[PDB]
Design an enzyme around this catalytic site. Sequence first.
Site, PDB file in Angstrom:
ATOM      1  CG  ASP A 298      -2.207  -0.822   1.442  1.00 46.04           C
ATOM      2  OD1 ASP A 298      -2.846  -0.463   2.215  1.00 46.04           O
ATOM      3  OD2 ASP A 298      -2.100  -1.956   0.713  1.00 46.04           O
TER       4      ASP A 298
ATOM      5  CB  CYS B  82      -8.938   3.520   3.460  1.00 41.06           C
ATOM      6  SG  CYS B  82      -9.798   2.578   2.539  1.00 41.06           S
TER       7      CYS B  82
ATOM      8  CE1 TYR C   7     -13.676  -2.673   4.583  1.00 34.76           C
ATOM      9  CE2 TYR C   7     -13.012  -0.400   3.927  1.00 34.76           C
ATOM     10  CZ  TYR C   7     -12.901  -1.905   3.451  1.00 34.76           C
ATOM     11  OH  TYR C   7     -12.136  -2.185   2.665  1.00 34.76           O
TER      12      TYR C   7
ATOM     13  CG  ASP D  68     -17.956  13.413   0.786  1.00 35.49           C
ATOM     14  OD1 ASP D  68     -17.528  12.533   0.491  1.00 35.49           O
ATOM     15  OD2 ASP D  68     -19.045  13.557  -0.037  1.00 35.49           O
TER      16      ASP D  68
ATOM     17  CG  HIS E  85     -17.494  10.353  -2.282  1.00 37.16           C
ATOM     18  ND1 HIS E  85     -18.139   9.854  -3.397  1.00 37.16           N
ATOM     19  CD2 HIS E  85     -18.051  11.406  -1.885  1.00 37.16           C
ATOM     20  CE1 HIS E  85     -19.110  10.594  -3.687  1.00 37.16           C
ATOM     21  NE2 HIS E  85     -19.287  11.653  -2.557  1.00 37.16           N
TER      22      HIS E  85
ATOM     23  CG  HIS F 282      -1.273  -2.478   4.067  1.00 37.06           C
ATOM     24  ND1 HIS F 282      -2.185  -3.564   3.776  1.00 37.06           N
ATOM     25  CD2 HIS F 282       0.010  -2.362   3.962  1.00 37.06           C
ATOM     26  CE1 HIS F 282      -0.977  -4.202   2.985  1.00 37.06           C
ATOM     27  NE2 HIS F 282       0.131  -3.528   3.086  1.00 37.06           N
TER      28      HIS F 282
ATOM     29  CD  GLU G 100      -6.087  -2.230  -0.855  1.00 35.63           C
ATOM     30  OE1 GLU G 100      -6.654  -1.459  -1.238  1.00 35.63           O
ATOM     31  OE2 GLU G 100      -7.030  -3.596  -0.238  1.00 35.63           O
TER      32      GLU G 100
END
Lengths: 208, 208
Positions: free
Chosen positions: A31, A56, A77, A82, A119, A136, A157
């Site tokens: 990554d 991310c 996650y 935004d 996003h 990561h 990635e």
Amino acid sequence: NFDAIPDVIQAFKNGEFVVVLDDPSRENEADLIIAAESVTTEQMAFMVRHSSGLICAPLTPERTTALDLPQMVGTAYTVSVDAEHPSTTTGISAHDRALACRMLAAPDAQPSHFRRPGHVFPLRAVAGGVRARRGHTEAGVELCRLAGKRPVAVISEIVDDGQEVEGRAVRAAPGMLRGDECVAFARRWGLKVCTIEDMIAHVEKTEG
Amino acid sequence: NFDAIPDVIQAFKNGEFVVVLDDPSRENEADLIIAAESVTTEQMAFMVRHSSGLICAPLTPERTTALDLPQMVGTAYTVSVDAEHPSTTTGISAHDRALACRMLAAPDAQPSHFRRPGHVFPLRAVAGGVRARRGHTEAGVELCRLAGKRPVAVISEIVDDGQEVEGRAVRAAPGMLRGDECVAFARRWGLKVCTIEDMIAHVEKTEG
């Protein structure tokens, strides 16, 4: 060869991307990892161009609580976001995604600074760091701590886009950048490159 | 010039990507839109390379209920997914993301076929279609209906990666592909291009 951790930290401290390899036993993927606090529009554009484009933002549990970022539902996650900012437009441009990252890292960040959903995808690092989860996500937060930055990184990635096919909407032989390729990719772009394994070895020098 | 809707439909029916422009009053952005049912590994790679890389999957409300895809929390993101399949690895490769798309479109799709959360972002089109919400999400589902395909599309916004900077991890002057550029992009890759506005005009011929 891989760069020594201290050198990777210095680069990260300098606001550069660093290329990080996890274990072959694991994803065997590399990554791009950068500190979020000052990620630029231009650097974001580069990240998007040279990665999966699923940008991310690794952050600590303390940040998920401060910022009211509950889990969306293993990659941790949170709900996506935004930037709530007058310059944001659709939220997807390199401008907008870098802005969101910077805002997530701001010392003055508050939950109301983020529109949900959005996003950019924050990821909750486990409390124990890379020695606890060799991901990561932890690596990003671990680099932040190590370089003295705000506890928010940006990761993505590095995919292998395969080959261009003139005049056709396809790419031949795509995949993911692996091992050797990773180091070569790092050299090409003047970035440091290392492994999570070495990162752990580094952290154990202090933590056992 | 923009292509006439019927021609865009024929292309979509053929499993091609089509370039779709929304209103300047709206995002003023163009997306690559393709039917999900048979999106290939190679086409996915192309989509990733030439877009934001945030690969979404417009689908109907009926599909969100059949597949148990509740809203994550305005773009109607559902919970994200990966393909529950023996060939999936990390879920991010062009292979894996295209597989997830295909699986979402399968007539035999079931909720258990999807790991949650993941790397593909389904989007819930509004019941009323493009005449109800002039979004790329509706446009995708509208094209599916029009071309006689399964009610799942794949969309992504076409960003402007800006310019390469030799040996530096940045891109100069990035942004989003707009108007004219969009049509030129379509021609370069042998794709049809149209506007949502024209799509609506098409649908009103039958629906008023």
